[PDB]
Amino acid sequence: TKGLVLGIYSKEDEPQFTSAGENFNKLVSGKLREILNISGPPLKAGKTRTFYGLHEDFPSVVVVGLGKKTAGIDEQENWHEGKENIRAAVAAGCRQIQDLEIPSVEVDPCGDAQAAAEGAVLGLYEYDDLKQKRKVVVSAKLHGSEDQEAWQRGVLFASGQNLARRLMETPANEMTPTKFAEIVEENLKSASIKTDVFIRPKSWIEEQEMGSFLSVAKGSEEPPVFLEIHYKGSPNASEPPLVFVGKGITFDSGGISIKAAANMDLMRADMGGAATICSAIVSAAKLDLPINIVGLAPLCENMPSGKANKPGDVVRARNGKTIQVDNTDAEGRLILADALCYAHTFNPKVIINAATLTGAMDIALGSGATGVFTNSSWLWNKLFEASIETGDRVWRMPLFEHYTRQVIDCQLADVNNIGKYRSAGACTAAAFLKEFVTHPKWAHLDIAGVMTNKDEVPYLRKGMAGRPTRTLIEFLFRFSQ
Template structure:
């Protein structure tokens, strides 16, 4: 529960107290009226548990003139009937029912959405035997909302059916509380605050209905104001760059509709507020609409730009991602808890931009950026929006794993996180967390030679997702480098920037996150993920330059540089991957600094022996904007790693140049599959400011490209 919601409750709870002025009036006989009363569930320890019923008084103050919003003062409590037994402590949860007096309002016609008045469909209820008694049903799953669902929820009052049990002929009525989708109740204290929180949230209506004719409508109006306190909300709308021969502003479909709602004010303000908006730039306006405290307009560039063959990406999609990210961040800076986002003609790209752009790793910071809930503006493209959300969540999972400090994200912890995530999204999964004894049984000596330098035990993570209807269909196998911290070993790295080596398991993070995402999307394909996980540290047991080890395939390796450890652990994992009769093998690794030098952060370098595999990867990257670039896998580089003095292979090339290519040539010695691709992601491991919709930090790239690649491969059973 947010602090803002709690304060809204504190301000509005006075109207929930038992303050009925009628209880102080005298009856026609001249004696004060005395009524049995029970403790107020909102203010005392009495709660309602699911499935239980209890009588709860909720009379309304008869006088509220001159009171300010949120400041209604309770009247003195009326005398209590001491013979009345107190209600037992009970918890109010969604799905429970309780009898309570609910004042009924008889007028609700002509109200607009969000106007703090009941829907015209709500009827006034009367009961001569029990004034204002009603049934309150807390159930978010009801499908009969009395208010536009876009408002988030409402109270619905309706007549109750006759009692067939021979009791009273008719109950007073039923009030159904439809919970807003963003409200979660997890503790008794939060449950007790549910009704006032709903009343105080985004135009949610407290259904104030008059109990009798002599309750002034002023009281209801004042209570409406006290309960209103709507949370501030932002709106992000897109605008295209004007054509050369057109001076008129070009809104998106949603932007144009909103401008009509505000009678053209948005277009007018844009025209006088400065020059036309450039691509990725924002402009903010306040007070245009009662539902949105602020509206951020973002520049989308040229409309219909399509695929830019020079840049190798879809320019429309990239412009939307960057613009929406900028707009959402501006709303977040205003500390608004909610923002609605214009789909901009591509809801998936808009969702990716919003959720990738707002992500920031702040788990260990006391001062965090304000939480903000993002929703689609309108109802067009809900499925595509949800798909974009899942894509972004997949990349953000990889970012979280890569950012996590190495003393916490150990091989064991990494495997546990992936197991938990995978099993939470699909039942068609299998997770094997292999220990050191298993690794030794598999004779993965190359992998073990790296792991032995650390006290942290190694883990070989093996995950299976069976999404295809044909269980015998050959799987696509992903392999990811999982060095959870890389000091370089005996060939130790410079201390400057070594902290970033907590992300040297980026290959494992991206391939595992891609499989989690594919499972969540229910992609019809069989996938296997393999991640050798360990640390590379110097110690008395660590590899030394000049050591020789024998890999799982029998080839011997001369280790001349202990900082070239990634290829040593991948060698055994790649050979093991062939045991699954794979359709194709794709490995990802933050393998070489040489790749960062060659391509920087513009693209992932791809080395492959398959033209079909390259085509699928390239086409996927054009859609996601997380690009790939093909690198050479010549025999020229193979000769540099096979010319070793002591063994079959050397773990570094003969010459300093072409380091990324010689590393790929080394891995090729452990592959026999005709469809194999090696992705060197060292250059895209981290983002400074190159990708506008990613904040500074670990990038989690190319997770979305891998997911898109898997999706395309599931639809193409012939090429590979």
């Protein structure tokens, strides 16, 4: 059987159906509006109502509130409101169809086939892999034939996100460093033949003088990996690549500066930064975006042991700078210090890194937006514009020499791994990373607060969220224009 998701707008006499809803109402000789009318209150945005037996092929029709037809970019909220309405409403419709165990659903494009595809595929996603109680996986399809490219591009963007949620969600004993490197490799090679994957072993990592990455890694028995992803999509094979770097800690216990036990299981998602940048690169190659992109993810685990990093140790990063490890839980900093050095080798046009770096970001913006520190207002503008379309917001945070001073604490080393005071922890972790970039166009995104979803963005179940993957794909999309 099929289910049909149909949208309507908020209230004229009648609140308007979409063209597809209106066309369905004519095909059932006015029944759909009749029952909608005797059924109760007008549906508002994100609200659904389900009707049965109106048509032989659609035993379940779910009508969904899209909000005001007029909705556009909201200057205060910094997103396109209308598309947010369409993702929210279609996900709520689709999820009613899966609770009735119906295996396929025709979705009305609602005026924007791309965001309706994104609502349906985000909305229906689940991670029930290691459970014996799995949900019915239903397959969403565009209702109609008129903008199947826009539907399929949304399908594409919502899967990139879903790959990243899956990557993040999987338990750390399953998603080890080589296992993640293998999933990404497999996915990237299915995306395009214009790809190259290098799963670099410890041997290579130590030939590259990556001392601060290697010192995080040694306290675990799990072999680290340096994952080098290439998408050569430019016609000019010598066109300078954009490089994405991502913190891939596959589990963070804290090391010897050990984490509290409460809710420590969420640190399986400390490789969110690698999940995010690698999924956006798989999507860019599926999209055959005409640009060269390198992806760099140092993968390792941070564990207490008799060979772990000790508070006070001084390690040497690939640029020769010494780093005093004052707290072993400020490990991503260390990892990214070498990876951001290596990023420069590629002669990049742009360097963007992503990391679940700091609980300070969560106290600061708590999932309303991911924080970005950038030395370039041009980069800031392109990322900000990219998030107005996706609804997955970005908010700029300061790169002031003020926070740098706080981490240039000599004592034994050139730089300290944690700021001198507790204040502005996101700001001093970003200033730490500035010490390893000499590039005029670098952006640091702190993903820690947008790592999980509970109820905040309606089209995502409660779980690891995969954010800001579509802001990154959209940024690449527009850049390759």
